[PDB]
Amino acid sequence: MILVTGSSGQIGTELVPYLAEKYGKKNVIASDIVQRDTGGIKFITLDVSNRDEIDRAVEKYSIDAIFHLAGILSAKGEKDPALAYKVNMNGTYNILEAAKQHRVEKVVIPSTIGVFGPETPKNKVPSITITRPRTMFGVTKIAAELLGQYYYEKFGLDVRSLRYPGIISYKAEPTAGTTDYAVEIFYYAVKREKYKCYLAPNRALPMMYMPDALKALVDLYEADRDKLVLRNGYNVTAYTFTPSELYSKIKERIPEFEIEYKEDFRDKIAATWPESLDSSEASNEWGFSIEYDLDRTIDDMIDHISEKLGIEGK
Amino acid sequence: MILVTGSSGQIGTELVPYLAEKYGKKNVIASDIVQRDTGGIKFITLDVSNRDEIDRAVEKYSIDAIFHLAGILSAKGEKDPALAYKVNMNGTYNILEAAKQHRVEKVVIPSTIGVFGPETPKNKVPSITITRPRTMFGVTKIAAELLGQYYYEKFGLDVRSLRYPGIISYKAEPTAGTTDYAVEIFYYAVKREKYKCYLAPNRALPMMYMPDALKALVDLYEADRDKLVLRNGYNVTAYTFTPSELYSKIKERIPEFEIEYKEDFRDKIAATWPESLDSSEASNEWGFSIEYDLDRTIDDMIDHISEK
Numbered sequence A: 001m002i003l004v005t006g007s008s009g010q011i012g013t014e015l016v017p018y019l020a021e022k023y024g025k026k027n028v029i030a031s032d033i034v035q036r037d038t039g040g041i042k043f044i045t046l047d048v049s050n051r052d053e054i055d056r057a058v059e060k061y062s063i064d065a066i067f068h069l070a071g072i073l074s075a076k077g078e079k080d081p082a083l084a085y086k087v088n089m090n091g092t093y094n095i096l097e098a099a100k101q102h103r104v105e106k107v108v109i110p111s112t113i114g115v116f117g118p119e120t121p122k123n124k125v126p127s128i129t130i131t132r133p134r135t136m137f138g139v140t141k142i143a144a145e146l147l148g149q150y151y152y153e154k155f156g157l158d159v160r161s162l163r164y165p166g167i168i169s170y171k172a173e174p175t176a177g178t179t180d181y182a183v184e185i186f187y188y189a190v191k192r193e194k195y196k197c198y199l200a201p202n203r204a205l206p207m208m209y210m211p212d213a214l215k216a217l218v219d220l221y222e223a224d225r226d227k228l229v230l231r232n233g234y235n236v237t238a239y240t241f242t243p244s245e246l247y248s249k250i251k252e253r254i255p256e257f258e259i260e261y262k263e264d265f266r267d268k269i270a271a272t273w274p275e276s277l278d279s280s281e282a283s284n285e286w287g288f289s290i291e292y293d294l295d296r297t298i299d300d301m302i303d304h305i306s307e308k309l310g311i312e313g314k
Numbered sequence B: 001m002i003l004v005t006g007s008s009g010q011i012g013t014e015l016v017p018y019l020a021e022k023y024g025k026k027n028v029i030a031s032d033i034v035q036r037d038t039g040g041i042k043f044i045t046l047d048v049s050n051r052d053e054i055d056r057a058v059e060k061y062s063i064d065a066i067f068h069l070a071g072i073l074s075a076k077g078e079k080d081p082a083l084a085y086k087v088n089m090n091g092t093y094n095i096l097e098a099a100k101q102h103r104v105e106k107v108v109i110p111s112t113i114g115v116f117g118p119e120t121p122k123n124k125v126p127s128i129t130i131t132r133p134r135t136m137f138g139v140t141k142i143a144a145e146l147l148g149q150y151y152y153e154k155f156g157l158d159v160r161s162l163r164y165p166g167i168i169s170y171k172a173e174p175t176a177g178t179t180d181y182a183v184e185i186f187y188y189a190v191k192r193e194k195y196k197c198y199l200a201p202n203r204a205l206p207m208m209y210m211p212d213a214l215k216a217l218v219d220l221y222e223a224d225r226d227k228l229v230l231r232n233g234y235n236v237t238a239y240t241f242t243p244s245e246l247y248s249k250i251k252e253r254i255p256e257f258e259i260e261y262k263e264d265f266r267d268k269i270a271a272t273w274p275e276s277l278d279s280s281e282a283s284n285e286w287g288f289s290i291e292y293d294l295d296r297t298i299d300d301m302i303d304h305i306s307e308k
């Protein structure tokens, strides 16, 4: 039995059916504080900041594994750091302690490049490096990585984590993040509307397409224990680009659209993160691999976004 | 009005009177969950894990600055991780949030070399380095440094912190801490009793004498805000030595002294930490300096432990 926390988010929206197709709908339980269609998969309300609720869910459903996705992202976290701290910090502690107290075999946590700060090298950053985040989001995530590793070393609980770069997807619409522009831009492109980008034209960031992000998280979950040395904090990425480069590439497909740059607080956040990551450790220790390069995800996004907005009929 | 949390600990035992002498008796308030003598200085019971208690105390005493010393250390943290998290993580968050809302103006937090882990370079480690702690204590402390810096950058709360190595002192009794062997050893030496050391004979660690530890904390506190760059995570140290080296030096003074090594979980904790630190940033930004070298602290300890 697999429990997914924060299932209604950008990742959960796709991870839940992904897990169900691979392990069976009856073996997956979706949960969040906000319910959304789960395609026939069992959904339970669960606030991770409430340890009592986690205990009850884990007990009632004999949970064997937890994909802990519940949390407040970088942007939303800066608007309300107190909320980010409660949900991210204490929510993760609750999940770890609950898993340990009950007999949950594995806990998988999606970390982020948000654990990095200004002092972290900007190019091809390895997994073991400087981690001095400057956002509440980043502080809570590096703490989660450290607590996860501690729960394994101290109690033997199988906790694993990877650090995702910005994730591009079309099934769910991201809202509380900093890398969301990489998704938003496609909607404006397909509608031939001028896009107002909130990041600097040259703000380079590591990114990856949802299909690969899902495969990576499940590959880590299924990885052989004998090769998991780093265990927590694996850098993963597919490619790096700036808003001006992505715009330029989308234009090669849809020339009748434009962009203007009006930076806000999110560009200040992105400025503290590295431009590209070195994912060699993830590939060496558990076979991490990418199937969608930039060209492929661009054409795939235009494809699905067009059908979603009725540009290309059903 | 300065509030000191965890005032009954090794540092607080000496910091309270130290602050009183420098800023006046009426301007210092001692607090802890365990009350001990403060020589007339006002004392109040305060559990930092309880946000309400902090809010009330800060309001009632018009606290302007806080020296947050409350916390569970490395050894006790491994025996009871949940307690370390509750006290260290929840407690520090509560202190910062309470200080942010209520009109608190300065917060000093003693960090530790415990924020380092196996991947951290072992020699002359700079302040900006790998910080992947492997103890609950270390995890809560690196989080403390990060939250502190965050509150400063986000809300303008003047939070400052330095990373102490092991601290040697004689006024407060040791509490079986990972680095406390460096204090216990003196008690056995003065009594000419064989000492049973729980750290390996060659377990090298950075250390410093309390007089310098106190001066460093206050120097950091007094530094002009807009002149601190690093602000949180300042590596500070006086010297590096192993148990066998300290033993050998003590023996030069008390030749009858003997020692045996029975390493336990505390040696495993120590093994994940660096041997020596680079403290140039602290010196350059706020004038950190050392007045007691190894020989001087050894003789000063024997002197004080003896007359005692």
Ligand SMILES: NC(=O)c1ccc[n+]([C@@H]2O[C@H](COP(=O)([O-])OP(=O)(O)OC[C@H]3O[C@@H](n4cnc5c(N)ncnc54)[C@H](O)[C@@H]3O)[C@@H](O)[C@H]2O)c1
Pocket: A005, A006, A007, A008, A009, A010, A011, A012, A013, A031, A032, A033, A034, A046, A047, A048, A049, A068, A069, A070, A071, A072, A073, A087, A091, A110, A111, A112, A113, A163, A164, A165, A166, A167, A168, A174, A175, A176, A179
């Ligand atoms: N999307 C990305 O590009 C990306 C990158 C790196 C890391 N991550 C991590 O992945 C996880 C989810 O990402 P996402 O993009 O799907 O986020 P999202 O913002 O789309 O969804 C977050 C979910 O958290 C839920 N939530 C908030 N508080 C909760 C609580 N107390 N209990 C249960 N649920 C709660 C929300 O209701 C929401 O459904 C987070 O931990 C995030 O930090 C995401």
Ligand SMILES: NC(=O)c1ccc[n+]([C@@H]2O[C@H](COP(=O)([O-])OP(=O)(O)OC[C@H]3O[C@@H](n4cnc5c(N)ncnc54)[C@H](O)[C@@H]3O)[C@@H](O)[C@H]2O)c1
Pocket: B005, B006, B007, B008, B009, B010, B011, B012, B013, B031, B032, B033, B034, B046, B047, B048, B049, B068, B069, B070, B071, B072, B073, B087, B091, B110, B111, B112, B113, B163, B164, B165, B166, B167, B168, B175, B179
């Ligand atoms: N002593 C050192 O060598 C050293 C080195 C590096 C960092 N530090 C840091 O300095 C601080 C104190 O060090 P110390 O040596 O004086 O510690 P100590 O062990 O001597 O004292 C700790 C104090 O914390 C108190 N305490 C526990 N829970 C509390 C709570 N909920 N509310 C209020 N007080 C509580 C204890 O009763 C005790 O008096 C800690 O934050 C520690 O991490 C100390």
Ligand SMILES: CC[C@@H](O)[C@H](N)C(=O)O
Pocket: A073, A074, A075, A112, A113, A114, A164, A165, A166, A167, A176, A177, A178, A179, A180
């Ligand atoms: C690396 C980016 C992620 O943390 C998330 N998409 C965010 O924007 O906060």
Ligand SMILES: CC[C@@H](O)[C@H](N)C(=O)O
Pocket: B073, B074, B075, B112, B113, B114, B164, B165, B166, B167, B177, B178, B179, B180
């Ligand atoms: C660096 C050592 C300090 O953290 C404290 N004296 C301890 O023994 O944990």
